[PDB]
Design a protein around this ligand. Structure first.
Ligand SMILES: *[C@@H]1O[C@H](CO)[C@@H](O[C@@H]2O[C@H](CO)[C@@H](O[C@@H]3O[C@H](CO)[C@@H](O)[C@H](O[C@H]4O[C@H](CO)[C@@H](O)[C@H](O)[C@@H]4O)[C@@H]3O)[C@H](O)[C@H]2NC(C)=O)[C@H](O)[C@H]1NC(C)=O
Ligand SMILES: *[C@@H]1O[C@H](CO)[C@@H](O[C@@H]2O[C@H](CO)[C@@H](O[C@@H]3O[C@H](CO)[C@@H](O)[C@H](O[C@H]4O[C@H](CO)[C@@H](O)[C@H](O)[C@@H]4O)[C@@H]3O)[C@H](O)[C@H]2NC(C)=O)[C@H](O)[C@H]1NC(C)=O
Ligand code: NA
Ligand code: NA
Lengths: 124, 361, 358, 93
């Protein structure tokens, strides 16, 4: 089957950065908007990119802290996390939406990854 | 015993794989045709919706049909892009890797089949090790084993002997000396040593592998060993086996989202929200409630049932009887074929252009 | 001499074929992608023309654009049908037959390569019969011979060693004993007799063919014989199958995939659309078609078709449909799904006009 | 490698037969059949052709001395007024 595979998670100290990657296999990447969700609570939208790559959207919670981008040559979407906080601890999940806007809203995502765990420590 | 010809437990699993690989080109043709057929069905639905919108111009139902047409045209477009970028390479690669491996296997099996001295001594023996086997009518000793690539016609993809985990029948063999080798049958292909094997004045320099790395023939007087290929991992001396397994596992068929209809309500159907935002609300960032309000105007709701109801109206709309053959159906849902519906759309576009001129001059 | 290892004149022509067959799947991917690309270009032109028609209702050129859109839509439709019915089977068949034969050849070559006793005695010898050869990168003894199916990327295959007539290097052999076999190298794969060949207690019970029927290994103390495969016609069937499948390929080059440069009336779909939608008659004279075309195109030659295509390509779309600072002329836009949603916008605008007009 | 070969019968190779109208000419138009297989046309002279999509063949039941040629026209009407045949056979005398 189609697979979305996240990687890059782990145990990280609060305040620094972390790059997550999601690679799509079996799928025409250029046909799909790609988004990051996270689940601790109910699942929540984090960031998304339109199918064209021209528009990028963020949850209010992460705007100005996280960025997202996509590399069509590698079938990969990235989540660049900065200013990591304990409230960012969650399983981070990649999703694909055919010819989508790169938003949450009315979108129905046809494919989902299984997720990568990010745990932000504020102890030493 | 070491250095003796091979009983059916050894070669029958290779025949089974060979016969299954023979169907990979057939499945590739089936899948490429299925992808095109599904794109064509999407395009037909787009064209029927488009024709309905031209006939019923200036109505809320026609605006619903513009939304339906856009949905299906985007699906047809994305399916062709997927056929180009993803399915073509998947299916060419599966066809090539399977056919190449099949050639490696078949050359080896055909060599065993011919390397015999009598009806009781040779390289390819029956189940018991009593008789050498013969090929007749696509079978060897009753086992389907054509040792040829069959003519290619489409056949739906399947998987029995080569599946997700590997080659089911190519398991670890713990006692090749008794289960693969016969006691008596002579076969110089069973050894690289000179007395009973391939060596002439001395043993071969090294072990020899055959059937693309499946079987290892030692240069000493000892039994063959085989790869266990039933639990593969991406990686080899037996690389062609891995390549065909990976390529087959990678196949999606014409079954990704581009090729399938959607059952998740109207606002979330491909293309719909963006078209409502861009053409009806004429704003970039709308709320779901605003989309739903617009959809109510044109579909009378936002669930699958209201989409289906508009599709039924489209399907029931007749065209002019002179646009179809004599005594032939005229309702759009009874018409199929892209080129056929394309020229009906052209007719109704010219009708629209003419009516526009009459109404505005 | 009979029953000795094979010098390079025997096996190098097989390596040449094997290497060329390795490109056949690359050619299949090239052609299937090219067909889809060309369909997509036809569809883009159809969409641009359709958008122009929706915008410019009220003018004669808008009706010309309906005719242009129909032409390109029909070309796109027919190209997809040809890809489905004809090119897919051609290219799968070429891929499969070439790869299968390559596997038959490569298994035989790889057996020769390994069946050796020393650096100077084995089944696969150099040109002079001095050294056994070894695999070195993608060569055997320096001869390009990977004995692998390479990763597939799109490429047009060479036709040097497998061409229209057959396998140019696999000619009739006038003296296998001296030209294919060494004087000294030992090789039990060179005959089926028991003293020096494959037989154990006695000769094999028949000749053995190898490499999908190319070489015949006698069961007596005599040199091999080979098929002449350089002048084929429709026991070595895999060689025929790969040859016929390769020569059958058209590529994405039939009429569905190519644009037309002649008159307007003879362009695909045009005369029938004029008859059916404008004259509204089942039969017409060429005169009558020309008169209609002059109303909408100002002529009937390729120059007037080009001129309407220029109006189409120059027409801007609303800036909100492409994004800030991005090109707006239809001829500066490409991509089927991109143009499809622009057409939907202008269809919605048309519906709003008719809602008031009606 | 598209080929039309006359033998009456005309077999198309290398082509999606169902995309083409097929016509018979002489050396002038003689007869033709639409791409859909639904309409037939004839030269006046010859007044009073068929196709098998499973065999990629068009037939001419004849019941005149010239070379008779086969021709294919993409999505064509089956006539020879304004049309442009993309593929031509060699002809049968
Ligand atoms: C995605 O879903 C859409 C919507 O369902 C689908 O398009 C629909 O295709 C079906 C099947 O072709 C059409 O159903 C018709 O319904 C009428 C009335 O019940 C039947 O009479 C029709 O059958 C006749 O005509 C067919 C050709 O159209 C013949 O094949 C058949 O032998 C009969 O003679 C037919 O069942 C329906 O009209 C369309 N709907 C629209 C809005 O176009 C589309 O194909 C689906 N996509 C995929 C990839 O499957
Ligand atoms: C069959 O032929 C048609 C018609 O030519 C063709 O459609 C055209 O495709 C091209 C893209 O390949 C479209 O864009 C043009 O592309 C060429 C080549 O890159 C450019 O030189 C053109 O630029 C000129 O025109 C522009 C717009 O007027 C100007 O902005 C620019 O300054 C140049 O003067 C232009 O971008 C072209 O718009 C379409 N034509 C139509 C009517 O859609 C189709 O692709 C061909 N089919 C196949 C299978 O190749
Ligand atoms: Na979606
Ligand atoms: Na033509």
């Amino acid at each position: 089957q189609v697979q979305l595979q996240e990687s890059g998670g782990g145990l990280v100290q609060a305040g620094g950065s972390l790059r997550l990657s999601c690679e799509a296999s079996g799928l025409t990447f250029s046909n799909y908007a790609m988004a990051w969700f996270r689940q601790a609570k109910e699942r929540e939208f984090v960031a998304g990119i339109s199918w064209t790559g021209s528009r990028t959207y963020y949850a209010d919670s992460v705007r100005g802290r996280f960025t997202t981008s996509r590399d069509g040559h590698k079938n990969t979407v990235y989540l660049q996390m900065n200013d990591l906080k304990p409230e960012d601890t969650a399983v981070y999940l990649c999703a694909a939406d055919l010819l989508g806007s790169g938003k949450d809203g009315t979108s129905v995502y046809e494919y989902w990854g299984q997720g990568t765990q990010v745990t932000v420590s504020s102890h030493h | 015993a070491a250095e003796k010809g091979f009983k059916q437990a050894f070669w029958q699993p290779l025949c089974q794989v060979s016969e299954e690989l023979d169907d990979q080109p057939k499945g590739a043709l089936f899948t490429l045709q299925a992808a095109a057929s599904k794109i064509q069905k999407m395009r037909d639905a787009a064209l029927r919706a488009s024709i309905y919108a031209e006939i019923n111009h200036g109505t809320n139902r026609a605006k619903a049909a513009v939304i339906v047409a856009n949905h299906y045209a985007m699906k047809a477009d994305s399916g062709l892009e997927a056929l180009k970028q993803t399915l073509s390479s998947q299916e060419v690669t599966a066809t090539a890797t399977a056919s190449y491996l099949k050639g490696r296997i078949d050359e080896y099996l055909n060599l065993l089949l011919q390397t015999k001295e009598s009806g009781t001594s040779g390289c390819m023996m029956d189940t018991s090790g009593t008789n050498t086997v013969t090929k007749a009518g696509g079978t060897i000793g009753g086992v389907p084993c054509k040792l040829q690539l069959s003519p290619i016609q489409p056949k739906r993809p399947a998987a029995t002997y080569l599946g997700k985990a590997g080659y089911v029948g190519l398991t670890r063999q713990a006692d090749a000396a008794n289960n693969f080798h016969d006691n008596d049958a002579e076969c110089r292909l069973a050894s690289g040593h000179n007395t009973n094997g391939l060596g002439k004045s001395g043993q071969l320099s090294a072990a020899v592998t055959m059937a693309a790395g499946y079987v290892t023939v030692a240069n000493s007087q000892t039994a063959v060993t085989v790869q266990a290929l039933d639990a593969l991992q991406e990686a080899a001396a037996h690389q062609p086996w891995i390549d065909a397994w990976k390529a087959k596992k990678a196949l999606t068929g014409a079954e990704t989202a581009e090729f399938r209809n959607e059952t998740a309500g109207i606002a979330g159907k491909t293309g719909v929200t963006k078209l409502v935002e861009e053409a009806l609300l004429k704003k970039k960032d709308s709320e779901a409630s605003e989309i739903q309000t617009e959809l109510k105007k044109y579909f009378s709701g936002h669930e699958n049932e209201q989409w289906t109801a508009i599709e039924k109206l489209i399907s029931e709309q007749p065209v002019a009887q002179n646009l179809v053959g004599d005594n032939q159906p005229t309702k759009l849902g009874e018409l199929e074929g892209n080129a056929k519906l394309t020229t009906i759309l052209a007719y109704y576009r010219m009708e629209t252009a003419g009516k526009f001129e009459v109404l505005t001059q």
